[PDB]
């Protein structure tokens, strides 16, 4: 969940206030309130987002030639479903025996 949480954080921080910070210098229309928006969300947010993007870019780069990140690809998960099928068949047989017993009443 590490990479998933990192991607979620990057997505939530993708729409930073840098794109909306283009109306911060015009806040001085009362004297020669929210003037603090021109400092924290002017360029520091964009700088942090770019730093995070660069960090995410420089990963291990595992995938080189073929098909990595496998892990099912194989055995008795199939036979696990088969055992579930055996459980179902036993259920059917128990139901037939119960019907026979009911008829035996």
């Amino acid at each position: 969940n590490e990479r998933l949480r990192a991607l979620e954080d990057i997505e939530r921080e993708i729409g930073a206030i840098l794109q909306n910070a283009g109306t911060v210098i015009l806040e001085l229309s009362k004297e020669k309130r929210l003037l603090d928006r021109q400092a924290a969300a002017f360029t520091a947010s964009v700088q942090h987002v770019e730093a995070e993007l660069s960090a995410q870019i420089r990963y291990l780069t595992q995938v080189a030639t073929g098909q990595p990140h496998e892990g099912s690809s194989y055995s008795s998960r199939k036979d696990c479903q088969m055992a579930l099928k055996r459980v179902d068949y036993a259920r059917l047989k128990l139901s037939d025996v119960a019907r026979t017993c009911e008829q035996m009443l």
Binding site: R91, L94, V97, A98, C101, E102
Partner: peptide
């Protein structure tokens, strides 16, 4: 007496099988 005992054993086995299959209804929650 033999018929009564047979009926009793049949009812006991039926109840046991019923109780057994009933508790393992949704063993696989899935």
């Amino acid at each position: 007496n033999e018929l009564q005992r047979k009926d009793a054993l049949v009812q006991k086995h039926l109840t046991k099988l019923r109780h057994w299959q009933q508790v393992l209804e949704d063993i696989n929650v899935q």
